[PDB]
Design a protein around this ligand. Structure first.
Ligand SMILES: Nc1ncnc2c1ncn2[C@@H]1O[C@H](COP(=O)(O)OP(=O)(O)O)[C@@H](O)[C@H]1O
Ligand SMILES: Nc1ncnc2c1ncn2[C@@H]1O[C@H](COP(=O)(O)OP(=O)(O)O)[C@@H](O)[C@H]1O
Lengths: 225, 745, 225
């Protein structure tokens, strides 16, 4: 039997594809097929030359090695265990909205990364989406296998404490935990409070190839005459 | 296709015999002893030897456990036979023992096990066969790994047996030739037959019940005294039919903490649900579901209700059969007896003498009891024991017999030698010693069993014998002639006459002749439930009588209540009348479908209450007269069976001179004469032993102990010290009452 | 009574020799009798110069040090644990088949190591024999002390993740996985999928040198009477 096959197929297509890319690109970089020297998101090079490779390659390629793979594995587990929860939580009916949020987060993170001086724009995105998931899923207890429980909506602070002591790059995650709050304000906090600025509007050219879940209805056949 | 047959258990315990029917053997042109090739499921084949049989039908073939396991089949399956009489004599055979059977044996196995087994039998074998051999104290299974010529060969006096090498690993196809089965139960033929039928129906072909559309049973209740082998019966059924026996222990469920007990029980039922046709066994049901008044807490009510709900939640799906074991079938909550729940009850009674003999035969199969013990005597002197007690007795006898050999195995090794096991034998002394310090557990239990007294034990009384034969045998042995033509059989017979004339003997004799169970309720117990106790006991007495139909219920000394009633107490007459009310109330409640016969005996016929003497109750009267004629001579033969001789003291003269005496007096005379003979023999032995202390072995002519040689003088001396127990007034009173019965009514 | 003595003696012959060699070579290598430079399977040296010194030692010499001792011991334990079990698993007789499997894997791994620029030819062979043993012994559940009921055909991936996160150079484990899969396909899957003749067959020379063990009878007794 193909247990791995059905486990992969059960994942939604967008999440499955993105997870597969994020797990396969580092292996490709490590195998020596492409020199990593071209994958570092160079600020000066991207500013001078367009260098279309960098804006996309900085979000996937992780130079994993001894003493640093623990963070890779823990963030991968958090990604896998928390992406589907938000995907089917409130945006299952409108996956286009989820893709638009992902695009906005990617744009913000790449803009800040060009403005700032960090190279790996992956962990901030993961921790920001975890923050927005926790904010949209407050009021519960935090799982802790070898001990007691905790209180919800404190996940971002727990991650901030965890990734600070182990390794570093505190500035990157501090920056990352701003776009999630900004989106929560604009999409959720602003409409009930002011509702004036309505710049957040998903276009239709992606609606055409991304319909809603609908009644599904499977497939049918034309009876004819 | 006149080839396929049906498999059933065999009566012969050899490993290379299958029993056909004479017509089938004749049709298949096979003669006695001809080798055959048997092929079964899973494309497994084996070779065997056929024989003749008595009562096996044409389509049935008998075979023991080993052949059935080798063919990889079960009871009720079918096999295809083939006669292949071209076996070629073998040359060299390699046989190896299994790993989990030879733990701590070592030695040379060929000289102990294989040589006696393979001699003068010419047992056919086939490559891959597995056979079991009984040895010192264990049963060792040997697997043939290769042969020459392959694959069929016959062991001959000129063969090269190789039995060297490491033991081989047990495979995962054969379950085992060591666990329980239908050959490990004795003394429970009828109940095992009932359960076997009732459970073989659903557990074999569920689709037949699905298509037919009938309701298979959903619960079976087994009840009996503890230690009679109920768990073993359930395990045997589950392991023979093929199921997923899943035991649930009552104390284990009650030992949990609060809310997890019912959760555990729920996982138990759902697991047994989704593990194919299975049997759920609940042990010690009364420990978790007692009567409502007994419970005082609240968790007990919750557990009982959870069990009831899960029971009612079974509707078709997989045919899961629930069995439960309880001690005495009245402590159970009455709510657990409605239809759709436990409804069918099977009783597992204490074994009788034959049952005990069979249990002893089963348990001592591995041992090497010497050719001096007599299992019949040990069987028939241990009344009041159950199966567990007999197993413990055999174990203790073996331990005692092996204790007095420590010198031969002084230290030795952690792996005991082999020939020392064959050097061990168990004698009657060890069994008696184990008997002495053993305490049974039944004791105060009503005994139901077929009495062994025959017709020749009773001398005379032809008319009474004929009348009992007419009243009891006819309505049962030819019920057709009674259902045709509307005769209402009598329900009871009352015996009255002089005391000590043999009423109990007549009751036991007719019970034996009719081959029906016998239950005796004697005067002491009857007065025990009279005062002190209550009258609820009569209810289960009658219920037990009903359960084991046909039966001959016997009430002895029915006039004890009236004898105690008339005096200077005048307080308990109410108790006597309650006894009579109970007797009458459950006497009239009996139906004609069942055959229960009530017999009462008394010696004061004019004092009994006239309510019993009425149609619909004990109505026939039979008068047994005071003995006469040389039928007292037959009486004397009856108790002189085992007593050796009488030489020349003509018993006919004694019968002529001893007129007006009952049977008890004559038996007393015989016992007194035997006592005198014993006294004389013992004093002679003591004289001889104190004489031998002076002259050392000075005995030219060899005399053994004086053979029992009762003379006339002993009998005459005993006869001098004899009188007549029954006076002349009682017989005249009895004949006066007889004449009043003849004329007044 | 030397437990090491009979413990070594009871080992199957080829596994015995292989274990003895793989233990003996590192000790002398660390003693200093032979410099490490003499034994690395240098590709260009081997292609240009015949260099008959280094066709074999690439699988025997290991620079053990206080950075890889744990990997060395765990690999040695895996060899000892599963090579013998495969020997007693469906390979009790006909050792020539097992020897040919080993020699073919060695030849192909040497050729491909010449193709790449790899040095130490131990891990792929051990992990590949483990992989083929697990594949032939699939569907059975086994795990470690804390591993409750882990299923088969998953240990190779677990050890892949382990020695990738802890360590590196995943290329040789990957090629071990491929060589194991292709050998399984050729010896087992192909003859039953297409019915073609065995492309790989043991020559009679090996049977001459390594005859397959037949049934032995020892000495018995006559039944007589
Ligand atoms: N034919 C038999 N009848 C009764 N008991 C037997 C028989 N054969 C063996 N036994 C012994 O009786 C025991 C049965 O267990 P038992 O205590 O009766 O179960 P439960 O506790 O459910 O009554 C077994 O240990 C077995 O050794
Ligand atoms: N045909 C017979 N007639 C009279 N007594 C007999 C006869 N056969 C045997 N007996 C003796 O009579 C005794 C039966 O006594 P029993 O009937 O128990 O006393 P009761 O009559 O008070 O119940 C037995 O011990 C038996 O030896």
């Amino acid at each position: 039997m193909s247990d791995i096959g059905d486990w992969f197929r059960s994942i939604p297509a967008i999440t499955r594809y993105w997870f597969a890319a994020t797990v396969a690109v580092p292996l490709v970089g490590k195998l020596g097929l492409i020199s990593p020297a071209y994958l570092f998101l160079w600020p000066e090079a991207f500013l001078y030359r367009f260098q279309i490779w960098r804006p996309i390659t900085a979000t996937f390629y992780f130079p994993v090695g001894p003493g640093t793979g623990f963070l890779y594995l823990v963030n991968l587990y958090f990604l896998y265990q928390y992406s589907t929860r938000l995907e089917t939580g409130a945006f299952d009916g409108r996956p286009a909205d989820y893709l638009f949020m992902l695009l906005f987060n990617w744009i913000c993170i790449v803009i800040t990364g060009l403005a700032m001086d960090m190279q790996l724009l992956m962990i901030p995105l993961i921790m920001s989406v975890l923050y927005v998931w926790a904010q949209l899923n407050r009021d519960m207890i935090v799982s802790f296998w070898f001990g007691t429980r905790f209180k919800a909506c404190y996940l971002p602070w727990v991650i901030l404490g965890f990734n600070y002591i182990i390794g570093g790059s505190v500035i990157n995650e501090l920056i990352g935990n701003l776009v999630g709050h900004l989106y929560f304000f604009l999409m959720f906090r602003y409409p009930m409070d002011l509702g004036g600025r309505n710049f957040l509007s998903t276009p239709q050219f992606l609606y055409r190839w991304l319909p809603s879940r609908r009644h599904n209805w499977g497939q049918g056949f034309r009876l004819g005459d | 296709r006149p080839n396929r047959l049906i498999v059933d258990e065999a009566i012969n315990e050899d490993n290379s015999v299958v029993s056909l029917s004479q017509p089938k053997m004749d049709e298949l042109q096979l003669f006695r002893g001809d080798t055959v090739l048997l092929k079964g499921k899973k494309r497994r084949e084996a070779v065997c030897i056929v024989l003749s049989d008595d009562t096996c039908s044409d389509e049935k073939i008998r075979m023991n456990r080993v052949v059935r396991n080798n063919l990889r089949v079960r009871l009720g399956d079918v096999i295809s036979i083939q006669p292949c009489p071209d076996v070629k004599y073998g040359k060299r055979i390699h046989v190896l023992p299994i790993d989990d059977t030879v733990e701590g044996i070592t030695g040379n196995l060929f000289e102990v096990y294989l040589k006696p087994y393979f001699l003068e039998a010419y047992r056919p074998i086939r490559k891959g066969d597995i056979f079991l051999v009984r040895g010192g104290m264990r049963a060792v299974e040997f697997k043939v790994v290769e042969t020459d010529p392959s694959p069929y060969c016959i062991v001959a006096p000129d063969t090269v047996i190789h039995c060297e090498g490491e033991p081989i690993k047990r495979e995962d196809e054969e379950e085992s030739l060591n666990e329980v089965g239908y050959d490990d139960i004795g003394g429970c033929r009828k109940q095992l037959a009932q359960i076997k039928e009732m459970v073989e129906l659903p557990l074999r072909h569920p689709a037949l019940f699905k298509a037919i559309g009938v309701k298979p049973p959903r619960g079976i209740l087994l009840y009996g005294p503890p230690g009679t082998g109920k768990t073993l019966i359930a395990r045997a059924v589950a392991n023979e039919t093929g199921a997923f026996f899943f035991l649930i222990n009552g104390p284990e469920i009650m030992s949990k903490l609060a809310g997890e007990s019912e959760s555990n029980l729920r996982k138990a039922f759902e697991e047994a649900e989704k593990n194919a046709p299975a049997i759920i066994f609940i042990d010690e049901l009364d420990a978790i579901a007692p009567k409502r008044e007994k419970t005082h807490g609240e968790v007990e009510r919750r557990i009982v209700s959870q069990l009831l709900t899960l029971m009612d939640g079974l509707k078709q799906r997989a045919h899961v059969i629930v069995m439960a074991a309880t001690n005495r079938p009245n402590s159970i909550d009455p709510a657990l007896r409605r239809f759709g729940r436990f409804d069918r009850e099977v009783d597992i009674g204490i074994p009788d003498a034959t049952g005990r003999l069979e249990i002893l035969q089963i348990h001592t199969k591995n041992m090497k009891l010497a050719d001096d013990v007599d299992l019949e005597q040990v069987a028939n002197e241990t009344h009041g024991h159950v199966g567990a007690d007999l197993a413990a007795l055999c174990s203790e006898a073996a331990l005692q017999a092996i204790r007095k050999k420590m010198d031969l195995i002084d230290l030795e090794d952690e792996t005991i030698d082999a020939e020392v096991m064959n050097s061990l034998a168990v004698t009657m002394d060890d069994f008696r010693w184990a008997l002495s310090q053993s305490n049974p557990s039944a004791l105060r239990e009503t005994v139901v069993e077929v009495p062994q007294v025959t017709w020749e034990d009773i001398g005379g009384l032809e008319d009474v014998k004929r009348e009992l034969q007419e009243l009891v045998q006819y309505p049962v042995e030819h019920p057709d002639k009674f259902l045709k033509f509307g005769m209402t059989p009598s329900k009871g017979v009352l015996f009255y006459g002089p005391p000590g004339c043999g009423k109990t003997l007549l009751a036991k004799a007719i019970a034996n002749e009719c081959q029906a169970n016998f239950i005796s309720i004697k005067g002491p117990e009857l007065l025990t439930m009279w005062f002190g106790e209550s009258e609820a006991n009569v209810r289960e007495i009658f219920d037990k009588a009903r359960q084991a139909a046909p039966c001959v219920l016997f009430f002895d000394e029915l006039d004890s209540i009236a004898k105690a009633r008339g005096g200077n107490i005048g307080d308990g007459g109410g108790a006597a009348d309650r006894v009579i009310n109970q007797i009458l109330t459950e006497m009239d409640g009996m139906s004609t479908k069942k055959n229960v016969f009530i017999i009462g005996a008394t010696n004061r016929p004019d004092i009994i209450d006239p309510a019993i003497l009425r149609p619909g109750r004990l109505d026939q009267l039979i008068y047994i007269p005071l003995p006469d004629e040389k039928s007292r001579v037959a009486i004397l033969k009856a108790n002189l069976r085992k007593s050796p001789v009488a030489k020349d003291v003509d018993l006919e003269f004694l019968a002529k001179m001893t007129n007006g005496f009952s049977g008890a007096d004559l038996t007393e005379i015989c016992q007194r004469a035997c006592k005198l003979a014993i006294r004389e023999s013992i004093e002679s032995e003591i004289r001889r032993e104190r004489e031998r202390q002076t002259n050392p072995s000075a005995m030219e002519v060899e005399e053994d102990d004086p053979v029992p040689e009762i003379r006339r003088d002993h009998f005459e001396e005993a006869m001098r010290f004899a009188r007549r127990s029954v006076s002349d007034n009682d017989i005249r009173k009895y004949e006066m009452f007889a004449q009043t019965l003849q004329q007044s009514r």
